[PDB]
Design a protein around this ligand. Structure first.
Ligand SMILES: *C(=O)CCC[C@H](CCC)[C@H](CCCCCCCCCCCCCC)CCCCCCCCCC(=O)OC[C@@H](O)COC(=O)CCCCCCCCCCCCCCCCC
Ligand SMILES: CCCCCCCCCCCCCCCCCCCCCCCCC(=O)OC[C@@H](O)COC(=O)CCCCCCCCCCCCCCCCC
Ligand SMILES: CCCCCCCCCCCCCCCCCCCCCCCCC(=O)OC[C@@H](O)COC(=O)CCCCCCCCCCCCCCCCC
Ligand SMILES: CC(=O)N[C@@H]1[C@@H](O)[C@H](O)[C@@H](CO)O[C@H]1O
Ligand SMILES: CC(=O)N[C@@H]1[C@@H](O)[C@H](O)[C@@H](CO)O[C@H]1O
Ligand SMILES: *[C@@H]1O[C@H](CO)[C@@H](O)[C@H](O)[C@H]1NC(C)=O
Ligand SMILES: CCCCCCCC(=O)O
Ligand SMILES: *C(=O)CCCCCCC
Ligand SMILES: [Ca+2]
Ligand SMILES: [Ca+2]
Ligand SMILES: [Ca+2]
Lengths: 269, 269, 269
C-alpha cells in the first residue's frame, strides 16, 4: 500500500511518460498545449501544461521526448520516450558497462543509456535550469517508461546537486548500471527516485544480473493485473538492493505487463 | 473436409492476401497488372487482375493494401496488408476494447484495428462503391492475412447492408472484439465471413480470452503442417462461438505456422 | 583449441563483420579509411584498410556491406552486414528451400539468402575481380555476422573456382540450405569455410532441421561465455554434417550469445 498522494503522483507521471510516445509531442512548437491520442494522458490534458522544448532524433540513440511546464501542478517535467525506433533498439543492445566516475566513484552504466544522455545533457541541462530560474517555486521531475525511465534515472543522477531537487519516476525501467551505481541511486540526496514496476514485466529484469547489473532500492511493485485499474492498495514498496519478491522473481516474464502501468504506455502513435 | 470449390476460393484469396505485402502492390498505377515475387501469388497473376486503387501509410496505423479488378473471376477484391511496419505493430498493441456501437449494438472492438479502419473508411467505401457501380455483377470480397484479416473483418461488418454482398476471407486473423461483436460477425446478413486458421498459429489466439475477446463462428482450420501443401481434406469446419478443438486449443503455440496458409504469406518484399 | 594464427584471423574478420553494421561504412567514399565507433573494430583501424566499394539498400532484401582493401594484411575483404532493417528481417523469414542447380545438383538453399545474393552477384563479382586484377598478390575473404555470414557463405560457393581462392568466415550464421548443399559446402575446394558459432546462440539453430536444413562441416565453437574474452583454447573444432555437441545441442537457446563473437557485434550505429 501507498498513500493516496503518492498514488496520484504515480498516475500523473505515468501519463507524462505515455505522452512522450505520441509523435505529435516530439516536434511541437514551444508554448502549445500538451495533448495525447485517446485517453493516453487525460490528467496531463486537464492541466495547464505546455511545451518548453519538444525534441526527436536527438543525440545518439534517437533521444526523444519533451520538456513541459505544468502551471496547474507547478512542475517542470522532463519526459523521455521509450523504445520505438530501430535506432532506439540498437542503443539498448550496447549493454556493455562504461565508466561514469564523473557521476559517482567506481560506478559503471549501460553504454547506450549513458551515451544517449551524454549526447544531449548540455542542451537539456540548460533548458531545465532556465526553467528553474524563472519558476523557483516549481518542482523538477524527470520521468520515462522503459528506456525513457532509464534515461530519466541517469539524467537525474547526473544533474542533481546543483541547488534544486530532481525527482525521478521511472516505469518498467531496465537496470542501468553496476552495484556501485545502484547503491548511489539508493542513497543519493537532492531528490527521490521512484522506480515503479508491474507484476512480471520482463524489462526490469534486463539486463540480467549475470552481466554485472543491479537495481537501486526501493522498488514500487504494482501487483494488479494487466488492464486492471490500479488502487493504492495494489502497490507494494520493496526495499533492498536487488531485492526479490517484487518484479525480480524467478518466474515466467510477460510482455503485455510491460504496457500496463496504470494505463496503456508505449502505444500512443 | 471442404468442397473443391471452397478450397479454390480459400487458395485464391490467400494469394490476394499474400500479394498485399509486396511493396510494388502498394503504390501502383491504376489499370496495371497485379504481380508478386517468387511464386507468392501465381493464381492472381494468371488472372486478369489489375489495380483499381493502391494505398500505403494511409490513415492511422499505416493502413496498406490494394483494391483489385479481377475480370477472370468477376471479383472486386479489397486486400489489406498485415503487419510489417513499426506503425503496424504499435497499432496491434492498442488492445483495449473500444465501443463500435455504430457497427453493431453492444459491440466493442480492438482499439487499434477499429481506429485504423475508421481512419480510412470513407475513402475506401467510395472506392469500393465506385467499382460496384462500374461492375454491378462482380462479387465484392475483402481479404487479408493477420492484421489484414482483422481490418477486412471490421471493414466488411461496417460496410455491409448498403445494397451489395461483401464476403470476407481472413487468414490467421486475431480476435477483433468482445462476444457481442463475435456474435454479430457470426450472424450478419449481406455476405459471409470465412475465418481461416492454421494448426497452432499463435495469432488467432490473440488477444487472449482473458482480455475480453471472442472469436466469431465458424472456423475453418487447416490441419496440415508448415511447409506442407494443403488439400481440401486437410480443412475442417468448426462451429460455435469461441469453439475449441481447432486453432483454439490449450497447447503450445507456434510462430512459423502463422506464415504458412496454403503458401508463404507475409514474406513478399 | 585452434592455433594462435587462426585465432588472430577469427578475431580480425569478426571485426570486419562488426564494421559492416556501422552506418557510415555503407555509404563511404571509395579510398577512405574504414573506421568504427565504440571500439567495434580496433584491429581493422590499425590496418591500412580502405573502401573499394560501399553499398546499402542493394538488390532485394537490403543487401548492405562493403568491399575493403587491406594493405597491411594483404586482403581483399567482402563484408556483408547482418540484420538491421525491417527488409532484412523479412528476407530472413523467406525460409522455403529453392533449387540452386547452378551451384550443385540436388542442392537447395534458403530462398531469401539466395535471392538476395543473386540480385547483387553480377555487380559484386565484378568489383571483387577488378580488385584481384589490381592486387593479384592479395587474398580474397568473404565475411559476415548472422545474415551477413549466410550471404558470405552463399557468395563464396557461387564465385569459387574462377582462379582465385575465396575463404569465408561466418559468425553466428544460420543454416543456409538442405543436406546436399551442406555436403557441397563441406567438400568444395577453391577456398576454406570457417563457420564460427558461440555457445547456445539461437541463430545457428535456425531454420530448424525439421524444415529440411542442415549445417556444413566443420564447426568452430566458442565455449567462452557472453562478455567473456575469447582465447584460442576456448574454440573447439567439431567435424560432421549436422554434428551435435557444439552449438547444435538440445538445450535452451540464448539471444545475447548471438551478439558476442570476440566482442559486441551487430551493435555499431
Ligand atoms: C522500452 O524499451 C519501450 C518498449 C515499449 C515499446 C513501445 C510500445 C509499442 C515496444 C515495441 C517497440 C518496437 C520494437 C521493435 C523491435 C522489438 C523486437 C522484439 C520485441 C518483442 C516482440 C515479442 C518477441 C514494446 C515491445 C517491446 C517488448 C520487449 C521489450 C524488450 C526490452 C526493451 C529494452 O529496453 O531492452 C533492454 C535492454 O537492456 C536489452 O537487454 C538485453 O540484454 C537484450 C535482451 C534481448 C531479449 C532477451 C530474451 C529474454 C531472456 C529471457 C528469456 C525468456 C524465458 C523466461 C522463462 C524462464 C522460466 C523457466
Ligand atoms: C516463457 C517465456 C515467454 C516469452 C514471451 C513469449 C514469446 C514472445 C514472442 C512474441 C509474442 C508477442 C506477444 C505480445 C502480445 C501482444 C498482444 O496482445 O496483441 C497482439 C495483437 O492483438 C495481434 O497481433 C498481430 O496482428 C500479429 C501478432 C504478432 C504477435 C507475436 C509475434 C508473432 C508474429 C511474428 C511476426 C513477425 C514478423 C512480422 C513482420 C514485422 C516484424
Ligand atoms: C512449427 C515448428 C517449427 C519450430 C519453430 C521454429 C521457430 C522458433 C523461433 C521463432 C523465430 C522465427 C524463425 C522462423 C524461421 O523459420 O526463420 C529463421 C531465420 O532463418 C532466422 O534467420 C536470421 O538470420 C534472423 C534470426 C531471427 C531470430 C533471431 C533474433 C535475433 C535478435 C538479435 C537482435 C538483432 C539486431
Ligand atoms: C489550441 C487549443 O486547444 N488550445 C487550448 C486553449 O484553447 C485552452 O484555452 C487552454 C486551456 O488550458 O489550453 C490550450
Ligand atoms: C503483361 C502486361 O503488361 N499486360 C497483360 C497482357 O499482356 C495480358 O494479355 C493480360 C491477360 O491477363 O494481362 C495483362
Ligand atoms: C587513412 O589511413 C591511411 C594510412 O593507413 C592514410 O591515408 C591516412 O592517414 C588516413 N586518412 C584519413 C582521411 O584519415
Ligand atoms: C511477415 C508476416 C507478418 C504479418 C503477420 C500479421 O501481422
Ligand atoms: C542476423 O540476422 C543477426 C542479427 C544481428 C544482431 C544485431 C545486434 C543485436
Ligand atoms: Ca491543457
Ligand atoms: Ca495477370
Ligand atoms: Ca587505418
Amino acid at each position: 500500500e501507498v498513500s493516496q498522494d503518492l498514488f496520484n503522483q504515480f498516475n500523473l507521471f505515468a501519463q507524462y511518460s505515455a505522452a512522450a510516445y505520441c509523435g505529435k509531442n516530439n516536434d511541437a512548437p514551444a508554448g502549445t498545449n500538451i495533448t495525447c491520442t485517446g485517453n493516453a494522458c487525460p490528467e496531463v490534458e486537464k492541466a495547464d501544461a505546455t511545451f518548453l522544448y519538444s525534441f526527436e532524433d536527438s543525440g545518439v540513440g534517437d533521444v526523444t521526448g519533451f520538456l513541459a511546464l505544468d502551471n496547474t501542478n507547478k512542475l517542470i517535467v522532463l519526459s523521455f520516450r521509450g523504445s520505438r525506433s530501430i535506432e532506439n533498439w540498437i542503443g539498448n543492445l550496447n549493454f556493455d558497462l562504461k565508466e561514469i566516475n564523473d557521476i559517482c566513484s567506481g560506478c559503471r552504466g549501460h553504454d547506450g543509456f549513458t551515451s544517449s544522455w551524454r549526447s544531449v545533457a548540455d542542451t537539456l541541462r540548460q533548458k531545465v535550469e532556465d526553467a528553474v530560474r524563472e519558476h523557483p517555486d516549481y518542482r523538477v521531475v524527470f520521468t520515462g517508461h522503459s528506456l525513457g525511465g532509464a534515461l530519466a534515472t541517469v539524467a537525474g543522477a547526473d544533474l542533481r546537486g546543483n541547488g534544486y531537487d530532481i525527482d525521478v519516476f521511472s516505469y518498467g525501467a531496465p537496470r542501468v548500471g553496476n552495484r556501485a551505481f545502484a547503491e548511489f541511486l539508493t542513497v543519493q540526496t537532492g531528490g527521490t527516485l521512484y522506480r515503479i514496476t508491474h507484476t512480471n514485466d520482463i524489462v526490469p529484469r534486463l539486463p540480467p544480473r549475470e552481466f554485472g547489473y543491479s537495481h537501486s532500492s526501493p522498488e514500487y511493485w504494482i501487483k494488479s493485473g494487466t488492464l486492471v485499474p490500479v488502487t493504492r492498495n495494489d502497490i507494494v514498496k520493496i526495499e533492498g538492493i536487488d531485492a526479490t519478491g517484487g518484479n525480480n522473481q524467478p518466474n515466467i516474464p510477460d510482455i503485455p505487463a510491460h504496457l500496463w502501468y496504470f494505463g496503456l504506455i508505449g502505444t500512443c502513435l
